[PDB]
Amino acid sequence: RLKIVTIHQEPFVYVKPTMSDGTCKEEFTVNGDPVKKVICTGPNDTSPGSPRHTVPQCCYGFCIDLLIKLARTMNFTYEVHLVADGKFGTQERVNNSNKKEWNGMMGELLSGQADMIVAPLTINNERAQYIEFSKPFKYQGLTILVKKGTRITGINDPRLRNPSDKFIYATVKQSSVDIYFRRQVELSTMYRHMEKHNYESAAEAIQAVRDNKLHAFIWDSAVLEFEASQKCDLVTTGELFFRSGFGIGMRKDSPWKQNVSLSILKSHENGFMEDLDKTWVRYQECD
């Protein structure tokens, strides 16, 4: 039974409480089909000041449908859990030493806490040095989320390039955005500014933009375009930059790599991936 690690990230992975009896609410997609739900154990509340607890929760969404398809095609059983530290994954020095370890889903995959990462995980060179990725199951990039009416040209906008306390922007801590910005001298400076405002999760950053507490949120276009399409007060702006793909993550020399990429290829060929977009991404107006 493979240990699958994932993360809360709508519309790829929705996380909801189980009903009183431990089951997951019966819901249906836009096509009238039952929404497939899996039990995923993980931290409940991450609000600072309250005790942490890990409990069974209900997970569903684009990546869960993909997981179910992969498991069926490759004939494997699995158990899903949410990454304990709630992060995607960057490499940092730990324990005030020079020893480096990956946090987030990356860390759990490398430690053995997980056997496969099935989430909107960005394929990048930094991570590819430590793990193996399947071919992309989704093609996307980075963009910027702002409140409707906010005027930003894109990543090269002066309010981003020449930061001040008048226009606050940020991303989610320990994600691929960090990795990207540390690759350029100029972006490194900008990330230093962002470091003072980065959020723990995408959900919190998105809410901050709606509440006028964060002026711009730099993040994955697959997620931001969905969020903006569902909330009439939020829009994305600027040309996409740092185009990239999301892939399934496995440990180095994993015997699953070939077959996982094979399944993904077939899904891109037969309409399965496109159907997932029509089910989870493009299906209704904002409300």
Swiss-Prot record:
Residues bearing carbohydrate:
N44, N75, N95, N162, N259
Query: Which of this chain's residues are annotated to bind glycine?
Result: P120, T122, R127, S176, D220
Question: Which positions form S-S bridges?
Answer: C24-C58, C40-C59, C232-C286
Tissue-level expression reads: Detected throughout the brain, in brain cortex, cerebellum, thalamus and olfactory bulb.
State its location(s).
Answer: Cell membrane; Postsynaptic cell membrane; Synaptic cell membrane; Postsynaptic density membrane
What PTM annotation applies here? Answer: NMDA is probably regulated by C-terminal phosphorylation of an isoform of NR1 by PKC. Its phosphorylated state is influenced by the formation of the NMDAR-PPP2CB complex and the NMDAR channel activity.
Q: Which residues lie on this side of the membrane: Extracellular?
A: 151-287
State what this protein does: Component of N-methyl-D-aspartate (NMDA) receptors (NMDARs) that function as heterotetrameric, ligand-gated cation channels with high calcium permeability and voltage-dependent block by Mg(2+). NMDARs participate in synaptic plasticity for learning and memory formation by contributing to the long-term potentiation (LTP). Channel activation requires binding of the neurotransmitter L-glutamate to the GluN2 subunit, glycine or D-serine binding to the GluN1 subunit, plus membrane depolarization to eliminate channel inhibition by Mg(2+).
How does the annotation summarize its subunit structure?
Answer: Heterotetramer; the NMDAR subunits are modular and harbor tiered domains that function in concert to regulate opening and closing of the cation-selective ion channel pore. Forms heterotetrameric channels composed of two GluN1/zeta subunits (GRIN1), and two identical GluN2/epsilon subunits (GRIN2A, GRIN2B, GRIN2C or GRIN2D) or GluN3 subunits (GRIN3A or GRIN3B) (in vitro). Can also form heterotetrameric channels that contain at least two GluN1 subunits and at least two different GluN2 subunits (or a combination of one GluN2 and one GluN3 subunits) (in vitro).
**Domain notes from UniProt:** A hydrophobic region that gives rise to the prediction of a transmembrane span does not cross the membrane, but is part of a discontinuously helical region that dips into the membrane and is probably part of the pore and of the selectivity filter. The extracellular N-terminal domain (ATD) is a site of allosteric regulation to modulate overall receptor function.
Q: Which family does it belong to?
A: Belongs to the glutamate-gated ion channel (TC 1.A.10.1) family. NR1/GRIN1 subfamily.
Under what name is this protein listed? Answer: Glutamate receptor ionotropic, NMDA 1
Please tell me the species this chain comes from: Rattus norvegicus
Query: Gene of origin?
Result: Grin1
Question: Which stretch of the full-length chain is present here?
Answer: 397 to 799 of 938
